[PDB]
Symmetry: C2
């Protein structure tokens, strides 16, 4: 249950000092609460003939006592909230780390990002308040320790009898209060049904324009509602009176005290001010358990999210089973990709794709039918359930994770605009290891240098409030620049959604065509010249590679295939 | 300010007994609270050599004391909530009465019905809780009375000095707490801006797919957030420590007590257990004022609605300046109606309508341009600002209000379906003075007797949960039956929106045509035969009667006017 909590505690074993300070503060608060009744006993001592010496300090005694209590409570709350915030931060850091290198089905299947982040935050605050109630529980436990200690110091057997008669009636009162609250809710609903019915039947101006005689009808409806209301009010008063049962319990406790007094042993003891202190502390003890009852309540309230939180933290890990290959030449062949939407049947089955080394080829076919799914598969969102995905004269997994990440690129609607510096957005990977001359060269290559860079700070243009200084076309141009500037060995992008409706379409297309040289990539281009300039093409049908052959024959056919590819039906 | 409150109090002067019981209960609760410290003083008396007699009863003393306190508190809360509910009911009754015979601009101009009803209910609950806090204030005031009484009984001059040193530091603490809360809110917002900014910047899975290096970025953002959080936490701890200022105030009070003790006069007095009781009560007094502070808070919170509530209660009354005329023959002539949408210019200006006695005539023209406004004017939603509206050889106002209400009728979208018995819905006015034979005759005249009455209980068919057993067409037929069954001298309805798309259109139209006989009414009928069978017609243009003449000429023209009237452009 508390595995992740124990993990965080082990981490904050580095904050062992903080934890010890927090415990010291809570214990100091409890000791101050005990000293309250303690010094209270000293008050009566002043009233015993000659006691005048302590009388003056008694004022200063209570003053400095309150001062020390405030100091301890302040320090405890401070360090406690500090520890809580530190735990929130560490939990968030681990949560992000898990979110990094996460699985596709996180966002692909569920609303992982926003919803799960808000759940993480809600659970963070919840577990924080849970640790806080735990600290309050520690305070109450130290308070009970002090009560038992004073009890042992005063009269061991009497305290034993007191504990015997105690707690049981308290739990009985807790159960009685729960039942009373349930009955109050039931009666309140019984009255509130009629209450809402009456409060929802006031329309009908035309009816008044006709007759307007329903005054007695409203009187009668309100009369029945008022009968139910009297019932509920009496129930609420009974709920208030229920605490007198706990009063009767404390009265039986006082009766036990009176019986101890009936034993002459107490008389010879003559507890007196000590007895006053004992009763006072017993009362002080009541606040501790009273607060402590809510501890489990809010504890469950928070665990309701914390369980799923730790589960997602320990959710299915993306097993990075991979070799360490620095770079390859371009000999990539994925064979027999048999997969479809997860938790379903097989639709893109045996989606084999074998490509000659070095050369760049393109594929065309139906716009939909899982084309984006095929792209994600290329992005290794899934794996070829069949065949042999041999890359760089070795398996697909037989490669470094970084190199695959380094070659990772795409030019589609999947654009990640980071609200940061234009230079920051220019270098997606290893920005701190990028030269400024290369940055200026890329800005020249941006195909929107006179427009996109036409903003404050130029090359250092920090994206404003959600890109308040950026437009859609300029944002698209900037994203294209950021992608193109990357010198990846193979920046294969599924660009079937390429359109010329954006600004600087000619310049952007020319820059893309220039960058396409010396870059092995499989993109469904939208330029007619680029389409006619392709090297190798395969006729993909039903969302999978169904046919292939020379691209010249397909280009020169100009029939149904060309019409479907161009006009998109 | 409290005029309506005083009015309700004058009404509940009939509940003077209830009020006296409530005051008695609150005073009993305060007396019990005083007796707490009182008997507490008696406790020490047991510890004074031979006191054994009271020792046994002391248990029973505390027990029966708690019992009496619970009894009094229960009775007070009970009768208090009873009075609150009674006040809610009376206020609601008066509110409905005002809502009855209300002005047009209530619903016509504003969302009076639902919104104002919910406002009335919110204000009702608010003023109820306000009276409740007032009762708590009465409890606190009686408690202060008891404190001052015990103070006078113990030591008048000492109590004077105590009151002198008191209250001032309490108000200072109140102001300090308000300022501390404001500072806490400011610091919490200062931290929470960055908190929300961080909690809203976690997206970007594609960025991770590319580089995934922002771990240190998150660490730094969280570091700044944590700095702000440490600031806010220290502020909250300071807020907690602020109560030690009030502790220091009570410490100065204890210092005053100690100085009184430094006067030997207290020593000769030797308050002892009495001093213990005095300090205890002073503490008990703290809870009273502590609760009382919120009284003004919630008082204003409720008055925020109560002021507008009493205003709408005393809002512009519909001055029923009218004579007492039982019935008329049908000689109605409204002249020079110069009015338009309220708080605006004049559009339907000089909308005169003079009709011969007895005969029934119809008017046609543009569908819109304030036709419904003209209908409402006929419904006396407004008045002819010019001309002489002479009815029954006397002014329009020179007639009984009931007779106008009796003649009030309409067959349009303004249908008031009352979720009640079919017989109840049949007789809109004076249902309890309607014969069952006439009810059966009307049900036969319903034109949907085989369909509308084809439900449970037949003639006693109570409309279910929002008419769960009724359909739209059956509901329209039932409404038509309810309207037609009324034997009003003139049931003039603006039926320009008449359509034949409903079920039993032929039967309903035949019944309407039959009922049209021997009934003076101005309706823009949709039946071609009814249109051709009209007696007198007037050509109304631009939403007002612009032309007139023989209806035969207009019917035989069959030109632009007929096309506009029929096809509705």
């Amino acid at each position: 249950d508390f595995k992740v909590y124990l993990r965080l505690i082990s981490y904050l074993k580095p904050y062992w000092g903080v934890a010890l300070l927090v415990l010291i503060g809570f214990g100091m608060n409890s000791a101050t609460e005990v000293s309250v009744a303690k010094l209270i006993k000293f008050i009566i001592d002043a009233i015993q003939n000659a006691s005048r010496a302590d009388l003056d300090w008694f004022p200063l005694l209570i003053i400095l006592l309150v001062f020390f209590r405030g100091l301890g409570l302040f320090m405890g709350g401070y360090y406690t909230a500090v520890i809580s915030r530190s735990l929130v931060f560490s939990i968030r850091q681990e949560v992000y780390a898990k979110l990094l290198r996460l699985p596709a089905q996180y966002y692909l299947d569920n609303s992982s990002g926003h919803i799960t982040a808000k759940i993480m935050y809600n659970v963070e605050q919840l577990t924080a308040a849970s640790s806080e109630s735990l600290k309050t529980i520690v305070r109450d436990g130290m308070i009970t320790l002090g009560l038992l200690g004073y009890l042992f110091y005063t009269n061991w057997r009497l305290t034993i009898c007191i504990m015997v008669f105690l707690p049981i009636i308290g739990i009985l009162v807790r159960k009685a209060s729960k039942r009373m609250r349930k009955l109050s809710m039931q009666v309140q609903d019984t009255m509130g049904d009629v209450n809402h019915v009456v409060q929802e039947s006031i329309n009908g101006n035309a009816v008044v324009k006709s007759f307007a005689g329903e005054e007695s009808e409203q009187e009668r409806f309100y009369k029945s509602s008022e009968e139910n209301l009297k019932r509920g009010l009496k129930m609420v008063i009974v709920q208030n009176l229920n605490s007198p049962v706990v009063q009767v319990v404390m009265a039986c406790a006082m009766a036990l005290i009176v019986w101890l007094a009936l034993r002459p042993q107490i008389l010879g003891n003559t507890t007196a001010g000590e007895f006053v202190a004992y009763i006072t502390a017993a009362g002080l003890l009541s606040k501790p358990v009273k607060n402590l009852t809510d501890v489990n309540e809010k504890l469950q309230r928070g665990l309701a999210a914390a369980h799923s939180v730790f589960e997602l933290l320990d959710l299915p890990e993306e097993q990075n089973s991979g070799e360490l290959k620095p770079q390859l030449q371009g000999a990539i062949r994925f064979d027999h990709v048999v997969l479809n939407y997860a938790d379903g049947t097989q639709a893109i089955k045996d989606f084999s794709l074998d490509i000659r080394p070095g050369e760049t080829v393109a594929l065309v076919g139906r716009s939909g039918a899982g084309k984006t799914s095929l792209v994600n598969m290329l992005v290794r969102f899934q794996e070829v359930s069949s065949g042999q995905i041999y890359l760089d004269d070795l398996p697909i997994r037989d490669i470094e994770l970084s190199s695959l990440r380094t070659q990772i690129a795409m030019v589609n609607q999947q654009v990640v605009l980071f609200n940061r510096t234009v230079r920051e957005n220019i270098a997606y990977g290893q920005l701190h290891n990028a030269s400024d001359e290369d940055v200026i060269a890329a800005a020249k290559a941006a195909y929107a240098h006179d427009f996109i860079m036409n903003l404050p700070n130029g090359y250092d243009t920090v994206l404003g409030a959600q890109g308040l200084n950026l437009s859609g076309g300029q944002r698209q141009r900037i994203a294209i620049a950021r992608a193109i500037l990357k010198n990846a060995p193979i920046l294969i992008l599924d660009e079937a959604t390429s359109a010329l409706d954006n600004e600087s379409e000619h310049f952007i297309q020319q820059a893309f065509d220039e960058a396409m040289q010396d870059r092995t990539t499989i993109v469904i281009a939208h330029r007619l010249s680029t389409i006619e300039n392709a090297d190798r093409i395969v006729v993909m049908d039903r969302g999978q590679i169904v046919e292939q052959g020379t691209h010249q024959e397909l280009l020169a056919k100009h029939g149904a295939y060309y019409q479907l590819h161009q006009r998109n039906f």
